[PDB]
């Protein structure tokens, strides 16, 4: 799986693929910050259902 993932490095330097890679790398911190908030509420609902 990791070997297959490493393929992105060879197609990121394209004319139209280099505006989506930078977009997804500039917002990684915000995505992690949103994921923590999402998972807290998800686990609270899971415990209530349990």
């Amino acid at each position: 799986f990791f070997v297959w993932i490493k393929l992105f490095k060879f197609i990121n330097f394209n004319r139209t693929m280099s505006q989506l890679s930078t977009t997804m790398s500039r917002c990684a911190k915000d995505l992690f910050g949103f994921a923590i908030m999402f998972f807290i509420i998800f686990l609270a609902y899971a415990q209530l259902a349990y």
Binding site: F1, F8, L20
Partner: peptide, 14 residues
Amino acid sequence: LGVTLGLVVLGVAY
């Protein structure tokens, strides 16, 4: 189309 290509690669890996 580029997004579709990226998703195809990420889907075959998964």
